[PDB]
Amino acid sequence: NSLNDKIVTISCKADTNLFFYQVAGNVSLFQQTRNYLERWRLIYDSNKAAYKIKSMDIHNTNLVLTWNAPTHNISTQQDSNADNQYWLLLKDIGNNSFIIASYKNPNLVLYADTVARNLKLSTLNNSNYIKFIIEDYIISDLNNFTCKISPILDLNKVVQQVDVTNLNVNLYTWDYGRNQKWTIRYNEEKAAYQFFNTILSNGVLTWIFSNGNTVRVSSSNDQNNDAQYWLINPVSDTDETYTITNLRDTTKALDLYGGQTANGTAIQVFNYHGDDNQKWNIRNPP
Amino acid sequence: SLNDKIVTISCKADTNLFFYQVAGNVSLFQQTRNYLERWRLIYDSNKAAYKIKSMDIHNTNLVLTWNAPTHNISTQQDSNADNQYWLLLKDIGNNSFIIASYKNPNLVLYADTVARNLKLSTLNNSNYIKFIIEDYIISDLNNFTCKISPILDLNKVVQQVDVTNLNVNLYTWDYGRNQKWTIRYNEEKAAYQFFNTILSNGVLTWIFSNGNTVRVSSSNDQNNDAQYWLINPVSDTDETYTITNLRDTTKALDLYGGQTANGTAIQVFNYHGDDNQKWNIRNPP
Amino acid sequence: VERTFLPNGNYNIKSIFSGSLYLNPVSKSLTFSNESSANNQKWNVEYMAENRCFKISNVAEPNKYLSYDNFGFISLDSLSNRCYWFPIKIAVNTYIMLSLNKVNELDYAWDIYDTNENILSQPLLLLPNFDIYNSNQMFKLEKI
């Protein structure tokens, strides 16, 4: 129920580069796609205390992870709320991973065949082949993602650090420079993110709260500054648009100064109102 | 997160039965609120599994052991053996644990509530293989009806004045319901409330408004974090605790000036670890 | 007179993981132990014509048969439909031993857990069977 209705990706403890991937009723293990083909909605039934694992496929909207009893095979089939479509999510504490057991027959759990790249049911053992990482899909998509960040007021411009010595942050036309790219990293403890500029090693997007609303890059070996960390919240209906709020004071949102789109325009923080100048596209660098 | 934590373990199939240890024998027994039902979870990161070690004060090295290949579970000397390690699998949404043998993860603890002991089973959906693992302090205090004494006069007690006067003062123990408190832990806020037993919904509340003072008031006021408290065991005692307020954790519950006398005000004051801020929480005799 | 691929008689029972460990009861469990040369490592296999299965009794306790309990363990109990085994011969005297009854509407089979091929002190369990390739489900029946 803390997992109910959550949209997650599921990857293999045995090979963290492999994700549960769905198409046309076939479940396979595939490299990260950061899209709906690897997203699943956990649906809780309190009576069974078990979950359906529903594919977020955009075309077939009612497919759920299904054990093809009496075989050991797994597929996605239409949701009929059957016991072989329910799963116990058993969190292995301290290992940050899950064993996923069939509700129909808990003797059997999901097993990752990393060389056939698919799933089967298996009895239990102590290997990582029966252990899975279940993660909120946004964290999954953004964690360790190297991106460029653009105001929705002009997608041809990016938030950039000025250069390697000049730590100021402003808006500029995209020119493919490393000062224009940022690697997002999720901090488990803080439940917050940092944005590391790729022109530096340890430089993070930071709210300089001792200078009002200024944001600059500074070093991440300043350790307990919440001002270095951010919440990244999706905007509804969109695949790439986010509001970005500061961990020190979550009412402070990354803000394009004035909504001005000229080269050199300040990036700052401002009280959150959700106007277009506080919305950001986080995107693959082409 | 669980490593080194001292916990009680009770049965989802019967929440009044706890893992109980005496002289190498493990059984299921009613709540004792003592070391016989306390276990330290000892994590091995390479095995991703735990030793479950009795806090028995006489034999200090006993761990929950599967006597493979038999169906029996006991406590034996810790030899770091595979049959002494357990996977703690938390069943999300159910808030209960399955406890699987590291030596054979197909087999998990099964509570034989009729025989009052532990057995093994392959995995299934019954409540007999699900367990409630709880920090021992929470386990002991949650739904505990107690009396609360300053350590400067054990024969005195924190009381509400009467069913209508909702003020809180110190007074000599007389077994009155106004002198007893049912503690309730709120899993959400990770803190406790003290329900006075002369009221249905009267809880101990720091009234920050009048500064430093404490009354009881209705618990059907919903989001007041001064209706909530943190209880921390004074080191190397049995019954002694510090009580700190949720809204301001520097603000411990305070006996006005150190005055072991009738009608002495109960208030908060800034923490100091000093004796008019230590309290004995005990079963009313 | 012979009705099947496995003649009636006394056998030792071994896991393919070890040629030096022998099936015997230990308390209420079944496990593979060092050679004892005793009757408790000897198993009387009898074909049952009506259902085409085998019942397998311990020579030391001839009124007790290999069966299974409600907890997933193989057991030694008095006769019941849980004592009927349906073997699948997969090599010379290598077998997978299914329960005659479907269990939880699957085939279930004798299964011995191994840690890097070590089965010492493991109890013999009854677990789902899907095919003939699970090493933990393979057992040797050696006539003796």
XYZ file of C-alpha atoms in Angstrom:
715
model
C 0.000 0.000 0.000
C 3.063 2.289 0.186
C 3.681 0.735 -3.214
C 0.043 0.703 -4.365
C -0.457 2.475 -7.730
C 3.256 3.316 -7.927
C 4.827 3.235 -11.399
C 8.211 1.533 -11.286
C 10.904 -0.036 -13.377
C 12.174 -3.473 -12.294
C 15.755 -4.451 -12.976
C 17.961 -7.414 -12.142
C 20.167 -7.552 -9.083
C 22.170 -10.055 -11.165
C 22.690 -7.506 -13.975
C 21.546 -4.046 -13.042
C 21.705 -3.059 -16.691
C 18.726 -5.370 -17.456
C 15.106 -4.238 -17.019
C 11.704 -5.982 -17.297
C 10.543 -5.027 -20.815
C 7.107 -5.704 -22.309
C 5.797 -5.906 -25.878
C 2.691 -7.680 -27.223
C 2.461 -10.161 -24.335
C 6.130 -11.022 -24.266
C 8.233 -10.153 -21.213
C 11.976 -9.974 -21.716
C 15.097 -8.523 -20.071
C 16.452 -5.494 -21.965
C 18.828 -2.526 -21.576
C 17.384 0.688 -20.092
C 14.926 2.485 -22.410
C 13.563 5.198 -20.072
C 10.114 4.745 -21.547
C 6.794 2.983 -21.007
C 8.059 -0.352 -22.341
C 9.906 -0.770 -19.007
C 7.335 0.764 -16.687
C 4.892 -1.185 -14.563
C 2.152 -0.170 -12.188
C 2.020 -2.052 -8.870
C -1.604 -2.679 -8.005
C -2.339 -3.772 -4.408
C -5.138 -6.054 -3.290
C -5.338 -5.816 0.530
C -7.275 -9.073 0.895
C -4.614 -11.152 -0.864
C -1.842 -8.853 0.378
C -0.317 -9.231 -3.059
C 0.248 -7.102 -6.140
C -0.543 -7.171 -9.822
C 2.319 -5.958 -11.951
C 0.648 -4.069 -14.834
C 2.481 -3.057 -17.989
C 2.271 0.637 -18.906
C 2.072 -0.346 -22.566
C 0.344 2.476 -24.413
C -1.478 0.250 -26.940
C -2.588 -2.758 -24.884
C -3.684 -1.159 -21.645
C -4.685 -4.182 -19.556
C -1.679 -6.526 -19.627
C -0.294 -7.880 -16.317
C 2.672 -10.091 -15.497
C 1.320 -13.635 -15.622
C 2.722 -17.015 -14.646
C 1.883 -19.550 -17.366
C 1.140 -22.468 -14.981
C 1.876 -25.368 -15.167
C 5.013 -24.310 -17.068
C 7.686 -22.173 -15.515
C 7.141 -19.415 -18.148
C 6.096 -15.808 -17.570
C 4.205 -13.504 -19.983
C 1.810 -10.572 -19.989
C -1.835 -11.546 -20.434
C -5.106 -9.629 -20.110
C -5.905 -8.793 -16.497
C -8.580 -11.144 -15.153
C -7.469 -10.692 -11.543
C -6.341 -14.336 -11.412
C -4.136 -15.782 -8.640
C -1.439 -16.453 -11.223
C -1.411 -12.702 -11.916
C -0.644 -11.777 -8.291
C 2.760 -11.482 -6.685
C 4.191 -11.095 -3.188
C 6.792 -8.344 -3.074
C 9.212 -9.448 -0.385
C 11.824 -6.842 0.419
C 15.161 -8.300 1.401
C 16.117 -5.741 4.036
C 19.716 -4.519 3.974
C 20.181 -5.756 0.388
C 17.800 -3.177 -1.112
C 16.253 -5.787 -3.421
C 13.056 -7.781 -3.757
C 12.167 -11.391 -4.103
C 9.008 -11.610 -6.155
C 6.971 -14.677 -5.300
C 3.929 -16.072 -7.053
C 0.798 -15.524 -4.998
C -0.730 -18.582 -6.650
C 2.191 -20.712 -5.478
C 4.717 -18.990 -3.199
C 7.072 -21.977 -3.503
C 8.053 -20.281 -6.793
C 9.661 -16.878 -7.392
C 10.800 -14.860 -10.406
C 14.221 -15.844 -11.702
C 16.263 -13.770 -14.216
C 17.801 -15.788 -17.042
C 20.368 -13.149 -18.016
C 21.653 -15.132 -20.975
C 18.300 -15.989 -22.545
C 17.222 -12.476 -21.397
C 13.838 -13.551 -20.056
C 12.112 -14.555 -16.822
C 11.006 -17.867 -15.418
C 9.685 -19.228 -12.137
C 12.127 -20.998 -9.842
C 12.397 -22.378 -6.340
C 14.441 -20.228 -3.969
C 18.191 -19.957 -3.583
C 20.772 -17.424 -2.401
C 21.782 -16.065 -5.820
C 21.069 -12.609 -7.193
C 19.099 -14.225 -10.049
C 15.995 -14.162 -7.861
C 16.529 -10.618 -6.601
C 15.164 -7.459 -8.247
C 15.472 -3.704 -7.861
C 12.100 -1.990 -7.879
C 12.390 1.739 -8.301
C 10.089 4.711 -8.875
C 10.356 5.204 -12.653
C 11.402 8.858 -12.406
C 14.303 8.088 -10.070
C 15.120 5.172 -12.345
C 15.120 7.379 -15.475
C 17.033 10.340 -13.994
C 19.532 8.611 -11.698
C 22.952 8.833 -13.376
C 21.363 10.445 -16.433
C 23.591 12.944 -18.266
C 21.259 15.599 -19.643
C 20.793 19.094 -20.909
C 18.229 21.253 -19.211
C 16.065 23.722 -21.144
C 13.385 26.246 -20.183
C 10.095 25.394 -21.940
C 10.014 29.073 -22.998
C 12.798 28.214 -25.442
C 14.015 24.680 -26.020
C 16.905 25.982 -28.147
C 18.568 27.366 -24.980
C 20.074 25.538 -21.986
C 20.981 26.131 -18.379
C 24.773 26.279 -18.360
C 27.769 26.894 -16.167
C 29.689 29.797 -17.793
C 33.049 28.024 -17.987
C 35.370 25.881 -15.871
C 36.557 28.812 -13.695
C 33.376 30.949 -13.909
C 30.874 29.081 -11.722
C 27.867 31.289 -12.536
C 24.790 29.700 -14.080
C 22.948 31.314 -16.982
C 20.843 30.623 -20.074
C 22.664 30.120 -23.369
C 22.114 28.713 -26.839
C 22.940 24.977 -26.940
C 26.449 24.510 -28.359
C 27.166 20.925 -27.169
C 29.794 22.019 -24.594
C 30.319 20.020 -21.379
C 29.502 23.139 -19.337
C 26.038 22.740 -20.837
C 25.589 19.131 -19.666
C 24.679 17.842 -16.194
C 24.735 14.417 -14.626
C 21.865 13.841 -12.230
C 22.514 11.596 -9.183
C 19.886 10.517 -6.675
C 20.932 10.619 -3.021
C 19.226 7.681 -1.277
C 19.618 9.123 2.233
C 18.399 12.616 1.394
C 15.715 11.453 -1.042
C 16.974 14.294 -3.243
C 19.128 14.890 -6.321
C 22.238 16.748 -7.316
C 23.091 18.015 -10.761
C 26.812 17.610 -11.473
C 28.049 19.875 -14.284
C 30.167 17.739 -16.613
C 32.890 20.378 -17.130
C 33.912 19.736 -13.496
C 34.199 16.592 -11.347
C 32.671 17.657 -8.012
C 30.652 20.762 -8.938
C 26.912 20.791 -8.261
C 24.026 23.170 -9.011
C 23.596 25.100 -5.742
C 21.268 27.752 -4.300
C 23.548 30.444 -2.832
C 21.055 31.327 -0.104
C 23.492 33.739 1.597
C 23.170 35.781 -1.582
C 19.373 35.893 -1.852
C 18.086 34.026 -4.926
C 21.385 33.367 -6.740
C 22.241 29.865 -7.939
C 25.767 28.848 -8.842
C 27.814 25.692 -9.179
C 29.953 24.919 -6.114
C 31.840 21.853 -4.806
C 30.048 18.695 -3.544
C 32.682 18.166 -0.849
C 30.660 20.712 1.010
C 28.716 17.845 2.544
C 25.690 18.868 4.607
C 24.261 21.633 2.498
C 20.651 20.879 1.600
C 20.903 23.838 -0.794
C 22.969 21.520 -3.050
C 20.099 19.068 -3.388
C 16.878 19.213 -5.413
C 13.453 17.625 -5.781
C 12.570 16.846 -9.404
C 8.823 16.562 -9.975
C 7.225 15.656 -13.330
C 4.647 17.980 -14.890
C 1.429 16.144 -15.859
C 0.838 15.108 -19.507
C 4.512 15.551 -20.320
C 7.386 13.108 -20.823
C 10.280 15.528 -20.294
C 9.025 18.511 -18.292
C 9.855 19.003 -14.613
C 9.699 21.493 -11.798
C 12.922 21.550 -9.784
C 12.725 22.596 -6.118
C 15.462 23.172 -3.542
C 15.842 20.764 -0.605
C 16.706 23.562 1.879
C 13.352 25.231 1.220
C 11.042 23.336 -1.135
C 9.052 26.529 -1.810
C 12.075 27.677 -3.815
C 11.938 26.525 -7.438
C 14.553 26.744 -10.168
C 13.446 29.883 -11.989
C 14.284 31.580 -15.283
C 14.784 35.251 -14.402
C 11.857 37.321 -15.655
C 10.931 34.595 -18.111
C 13.531 36.330 -20.283
C 15.025 34.116 -22.986
C 18.026 36.226 -24.090
C 21.578 34.798 -23.930
C 23.123 35.380 -20.497
C 19.790 35.514 -18.633
C 20.088 34.567 -14.947
C 19.052 31.204 -13.585
C 17.984 31.665 -9.986
C 15.542 30.362 -7.440
C 12.182 31.976 -6.796
C 9.076 31.242 -4.750
C 7.173 28.492 -6.548
C 4.069 29.434 -8.541
C 4.322 26.923 -11.393
C 4.519 29.511 -14.168
C 6.189 28.521 -17.439
C 9.499 30.080 -16.342
C 9.680 27.508 -13.520
C 9.281 24.487 -15.857
C 12.254 22.632 -17.302
C 12.825 20.038 -19.987
C 15.432 17.487 -18.987
C 16.577 15.811 -22.154
C 19.090 13.598 -23.816
C 21.965 15.552 -25.302
C 21.672 14.774 -29.057
C 18.895 -0.216 9.053
C 18.075 -3.284 11.127
C 21.707 -4.133 11.820
C 22.507 -4.151 15.524
C 18.875 -3.329 16.382
C 17.424 -5.055 19.431
C 13.911 -6.209 18.644
C 11.038 -8.401 19.739
C 9.587 -10.843 17.229
C 5.915 -11.780 17.460
C 3.476 -13.852 15.399
C 1.119 -12.389 12.837
C -1.006 -15.506 13.424
C -1.149 -14.529 17.150
C 0.234 -11.096 18.080
C 0.259 -12.019 21.752
C 2.963 -14.641 21.173
C 6.654 -13.621 21.106
C 9.933 -15.511 20.397
C 11.123 -16.501 23.896
C 14.495 -17.990 24.864
C 15.655 -19.837 27.992
C 18.709 -22.127 28.154
C 18.944 -22.979 24.453
C 15.229 -23.556 24.108
C 13.099 -21.343 21.864
C 9.346 -21.131 22.348
C 6.421 -18.796 21.763
C 5.242 -17.013 24.940
C 3.126 -14.054 26.080
C 4.718 -10.585 26.353
C 7.388 -10.322 29.103
C 8.903 -6.894 28.363
C 12.335 -8.210 29.335
C 15.479 -9.678 27.760
C 13.983 -13.167 27.398
C 12.090 -11.859 24.356
C 14.768 -9.512 23.031
C 17.010 -10.304 20.085
C 19.821 -8.449 18.387
C 19.750 -8.583 14.575
C 23.307 -8.979 13.395
C 23.806 -8.297 9.676
C 26.412 -9.990 7.498
C 26.641 -7.847 4.336
C 28.247 -10.512 2.139
C 25.545 -13.060 2.926
C 22.771 -10.441 2.894
C 21.416 -12.313 5.919
C 21.142 -11.930 9.722
C 22.030 -13.700 12.915
C 19.264 -13.457 15.457
C 20.961 -13.274 18.834
C 19.338 -13.647 22.256
C 19.836 -10.737 24.673
C 19.913 -13.289 27.506
C 22.101 -11.746 30.237
C 23.463 -15.118 31.438
C 24.365 -16.820 28.174
C 25.309 -13.966 25.891
C 26.314 -15.912 22.766
C 23.114 -17.811 21.794
C 21.668 -17.391 18.289
C 18.520 -18.681 16.615
C 19.591 -21.926 14.959
C 17.911 -24.343 12.550
C 18.846 -27.853 13.607
C 19.067 -29.115 9.988
C 17.901 -31.532 8.722
C 15.232 -31.733 11.444
C 12.120 -29.567 11.801
C 13.503 -28.060 15.021
C 14.583 -24.531 15.857
C 16.620 -23.774 18.977
C 19.276 -21.426 20.256
C 22.880 -22.676 20.069
C 26.301 -21.085 20.569
C 27.181 -18.703 17.736
C 29.603 -20.484 15.410
C 28.750 -18.250 12.453
C 27.246 -21.262 10.697
C 24.916 -21.158 7.702
C 22.123 -22.655 9.839
C 22.422 -19.572 12.072
C 21.725 -17.017 9.340
C 18.289 -15.832 8.235
C 16.981 -13.713 5.356
C 14.621 -11.074 6.694
C 12.107 -10.567 3.914
C 9.664 -7.769 4.531
C 6.263 -8.403 2.935
C 5.420 -4.887 1.743
C 1.853 -3.741 2.262
C 1.492 -6.371 4.980
C 4.092 -4.911 7.330
C 5.219 -8.383 8.346
C 8.303 -10.451 7.765
C 9.094 -13.823 6.395
C 12.203 -15.313 7.952
C 13.950 -17.708 5.589
C 16.883 -19.972 6.392
C 20.114 -18.899 4.778
C 21.168 -22.560 4.696
C 18.038 -23.464 2.676
C 16.007 -20.414 1.552
C 13.108 -22.664 0.475
C 12.402 -23.075 4.190
C 11.062 -20.342 6.462
C 10.086 -20.077 10.126
C 6.573 -21.317 10.864
C 4.863 -20.476 14.148
C 3.277 -23.584 15.670
C 0.940 -21.671 17.946
C -0.641 -24.832 19.431
C 2.735 -26.365 20.373
C 3.984 -22.853 21.228
C 7.245 -23.331 19.307
C 8.976 -22.803 15.939
C 9.018 -25.183 12.946
C 9.795 -24.793 9.244
C 7.730 -24.667 6.092
C 8.111 -23.994 2.456
C 6.632 -20.626 1.444
C 2.879 -20.241 1.324
C 0.279 -17.604 2.055
C -0.571 -18.464 5.686
C -0.097 -16.113 8.594
C 1.905 -18.769 10.411
C 5.043 -17.806 8.480
C 4.639 -14.078 8.962
C 6.202 -12.219 11.887
C 6.183 -8.750 13.420
C 9.684 -7.451 14.063
C 9.697 -4.405 16.332
C 12.254 -2.242 18.123
C 11.995 -3.567 21.711
C 11.158 -0.138 23.220
C 8.176 0.369 20.887
C 7.134 -3.244 21.503
C 7.239 -2.767 25.289
C 5.570 0.652 25.426
C 2.905 0.476 22.689
C -0.527 0.021 24.319
C 1.206 -0.152 27.683
C -0.888 1.356 30.470
C 1.632 2.776 32.911
C 2.341 5.191 35.684
C 5.067 7.766 35.244
C 7.366 8.721 38.134
C 10.177 11.244 38.528
C 13.309 9.476 39.787
C 13.450 12.131 42.525
C 10.327 10.651 44.142
C 9.219 7.217 42.973
C 6.172 7.363 45.218
C 4.925 10.344 43.243
C 3.470 10.326 39.793
C 2.465 12.456 36.819
C -1.295 12.964 36.957
C -4.159 14.805 35.364
C -6.135 16.602 38.086
C -9.664 15.336 37.389
C -12.067 14.457 34.600
C -12.733 18.196 33.961
C -9.575 19.971 35.186
C -7.320 18.999 32.269
C -4.196 20.454 33.907
C -1.253 18.174 34.695
C 0.512 18.126 38.095
C 2.646 15.900 40.288
C 0.857 14.013 43.070
C 1.362 11.002 45.348
C 0.356 7.616 43.870
C -3.169 6.563 44.844
C -4.026 4.222 41.923
C -6.458 6.798 40.486
C -7.224 6.546 36.757
C -6.117 10.176 36.462
C -2.681 8.845 37.448
C -2.370 6.261 34.648
C -1.412 6.690 30.988
C -1.969 4.373 28.035
C 0.913 4.887 25.634
C 0.206 4.593 21.908
C 2.855 4.595 19.189
C 2.002 6.321 15.918
C 3.962 4.485 13.214
C 3.447 7.395 10.851
C 4.896 10.157 13.007
C 7.441 7.834 14.610
C 6.409 9.127 18.030
C 4.154 8.355 20.978
C 1.086 9.818 22.689
C 0.114 9.418 26.341
C -3.622 8.759 26.777
C -4.863 9.543 30.289
C -7.197 6.756 31.404
C -9.749 9.086 33.019
C -10.488 10.434 29.499
C -11.560 8.626 26.342
C -9.459 10.845 24.064
C -7.471 13.063 26.413
C -3.782 12.981 25.496
C -0.748 14.615 27.104
C -0.265 17.836 25.146
C 2.446 20.489 25.251
C 0.584 23.774 25.080
C 3.351 25.791 23.439
C 1.018 28.791 23.469
C 1.452 29.465 27.197
C 5.165 28.859 26.646
C 6.599 26.066 28.727
C 3.589 24.316 30.138
C 1.765 20.994 29.752
C -1.884 19.972 30.011
C -3.863 17.176 28.560
C -6.336 17.911 25.835
C -8.448 16.186 23.246
C -6.789 13.897 20.769
C -9.377 14.712 18.178
C -7.227 17.665 17.372
C -5.321 15.988 14.577
C -2.161 17.740 13.516
C -0.505 19.008 16.615
C 3.060 17.725 17.005
C 3.105 18.697 20.660
C 0.516 15.981 21.285
C 3.423 13.694 20.357
C 6.584 12.630 22.194
C 9.848 10.728 21.840
C 10.809 8.167 24.495
C 14.525 7.344 24.865
C 15.929 4.768 27.317
C 18.336 6.201 29.873
C 21.473 4.124 29.348
C 21.953 0.927 31.389
C 18.635 1.063 33.240
C 15.516 -1.101 32.972
C 12.610 1.285 33.447
C 14.112 4.737 33.052
C 13.570 7.072 30.066
C 13.874 10.622 28.786
C 10.722 12.069 27.229
C 11.240 14.675 24.480
C 8.511 16.594 22.610
C 8.042 16.114 18.867
C 7.600 19.799 17.885
C 10.821 20.727 19.675
C 13.102 17.797 20.475
C 15.291 20.001 22.696
C 12.258 20.363 24.953
C 12.146 17.432 27.382
C 9.325 16.816 29.875
C 10.307 18.587 33.073
C 9.500 18.426 36.778
C 9.408 22.131 37.809
C 12.677 22.906 39.607
C 13.307 19.402 40.982
C 10.525 19.688 43.547
C 9.356 16.297 44.832
C 6.181 17.815 46.307
C 2.407 17.610 45.789
C 1.006 19.847 43.067
C 4.406 20.635 41.548
C 3.810 21.689 37.947
C 4.592 19.405 35.004
C 6.149 21.288 32.169
C 8.680 21.121 29.439
C 12.128 22.543 29.792
C 15.277 22.634 27.717
C 17.128 19.302 27.822
C 20.030 18.846 30.253
C 20.086 15.124 31.037
C 19.416 16.324 34.562
C 17.441 14.294 37.060
C 14.152 16.253 36.982
C 14.007 15.161 33.329
C 14.450 11.409 33.923
C 11.338 9.267 34.366
C 10.427 5.765 35.481
C 7.707 4.270 33.306
C 6.267 1.224 35.043
C 3.338 -1.124 35.305
C 0.964 0.115 37.956
C 1.196 -2.498 40.761
C 7.391 -60.702 -11.898
C 8.453 -57.470 -13.588
C 5.803 -54.991 -14.673
C 7.953 -51.930 -15.236
C 11.389 -50.311 -15.714
C 12.315 -50.514 -12.009
C 12.331 -53.988 -10.408
C 10.893 -54.645 -6.924
C 13.403 -54.846 -4.105
C 15.886 -53.194 -1.766
C 17.802 -50.100 -2.924
C 20.135 -47.459 -1.552
C 19.017 -43.937 -2.510
C 21.529 -41.266 -3.452
C 21.602 -37.730 -4.800
C 23.600 -37.190 -7.987
C 25.574 -34.589 -5.969
C 27.269 -37.347 -3.969
C 28.152 -41.008 -4.377
C 29.006 -41.361 -0.685
C 25.826 -40.073 0.972
C 22.780 -42.237 1.619
C 19.108 -41.466 2.259
C 17.979 -42.165 5.811
C 15.483 -40.803 8.359
C 16.887 -38.389 10.971
C 14.237 -37.484 13.536
C 11.174 -36.809 11.340
C 13.208 -35.642 8.340
C 14.905 -37.450 5.450
C 18.543 -36.656 4.752
C 21.611 -38.087 2.988
C 24.289 -39.298 5.409
C 27.548 -41.240 5.625
C 27.321 -44.931 4.760
C 26.104 -46.869 7.819
C 25.573 -50.340 6.309
C 22.432 -50.378 8.488
C 18.828 -51.191 7.549
C 17.810 -47.519 7.826
C 19.671 -46.804 4.577
C 17.839 -49.622 2.783
C 14.586 -48.922 0.891
C 12.074 -51.511 -0.318
C 10.634 -50.444 -3.663
C 7.288 -52.043 -4.592
C 5.403 -51.492 -7.838
C 1.660 -50.938 -7.511
C -0.138 -52.294 -10.578
C -3.485 -50.527 -10.082
C -2.056 -46.967 -10.241
C 1.295 -47.697 -11.940
C 3.243 -46.138 -9.101
C 5.760 -47.201 -6.491
C 5.620 -47.306 -2.741
C 8.964 -47.178 -0.948
C 9.301 -48.374 2.650
C 12.271 -48.212 5.017
C 13.683 -51.706 5.691
C 14.349 -50.758 9.341
C 10.725 -49.662 9.748
C 8.875 -51.680 7.112
C 5.426 -50.290 7.947
C 6.614 -46.724 7.257
C 6.734 -45.300 3.708
C 8.207 -42.243 2.003
C 5.430 -39.679 2.036
C 5.199 -35.890 2.412
C 3.863 -33.528 5.081
C 1.874 -30.260 4.970
C 5.110 -28.246 5.303
C 6.943 -29.238 2.146
C 9.123 -31.991 3.667
C 9.381 -35.628 2.600
C 8.404 -37.808 5.573
C 8.240 -41.412 6.718
C 4.589 -42.227 7.441
C 1.991 -44.971 7.374
C 0.373 -45.814 4.047
C -1.773 -43.189 2.305
C -2.097 -41.775 -1.247
C 0.836 -39.526 -0.376
C 3.088 -42.626 -0.484
C 2.736 -43.250 -4.252
C 5.686 -42.119 -6.358
C 5.877 -41.750 -10.131
C 9.488 -41.995 -11.293
C 10.961 -40.704 -14.477
C 14.075 -42.577 -15.462
C 16.536 -40.196 -17.107
C 19.718 -42.250 -17.060
C 21.042 -45.650 -15.981
C 19.633 -45.623 -12.529
C 18.938 -41.968 -12.244
C 15.379 -40.843 -11.562
C 13.166 -37.900 -10.917
C 10.541 -38.859 -8.350
C 7.196 -37.187 -8.823
C 4.374 -37.403 -6.354
C 1.536 -39.430 -7.989
C -0.955 -36.651 -7.037
C -0.694 -33.210 -8.647
C 0.107 -30.838 -5.777
C -1.158 -27.264 -6.031
C -2.103 -28.439 -9.557
C 1.547 -28.992 -10.546
C 3.923 -31.896 -10.678
C 5.910 -31.968 -7.402
C 9.129 -33.922 -6.952
C 11.758 -34.905 -4.391
C 14.199 -31.990 -4.217
C 17.439 -31.676 -2.273
C 19.023 -28.230 -1.917
C 22.759 -27.939 -2.574
C 25.350 -25.302 -1.714
C 27.999 -25.713 -4.409
C 26.969 -29.391 -4.679
C 27.165 -29.922 -0.918
C 23.966 -31.481 0.493
C 25.156 -32.335 4.072
C 22.349 -31.895 6.650
C 19.777 -30.781 4.064
C 16.300 -32.273 4.427
C 14.690 -33.819 1.365
C 11.774 -31.600 0.291
C 8.852 -31.896 -2.153
C 9.008 -29.017 -4.658
C 7.547 -28.123 -8.063
C 8.864 -29.987 -11.091
C 8.932 -28.509 -14.600
C 11.266 -30.707 -16.659
C 13.966 -33.345 -16.472
C 17.009 -31.088 -16.084
C 16.855 -29.968 -12.434
C 19.941 -31.536 -10.744
C 18.358 -31.028 -7.320
C 15.608 -33.412 -8.406
C 17.794 -36.230 -9.676
C 18.309 -39.328 -7.582
C 20.132 -42.622 -7.893
C 18.441 -45.855 -6.994
C 21.120 -48.492 -6.452
C 19.933 -52.067 -6.037
C 21.393 -53.586 -2.826
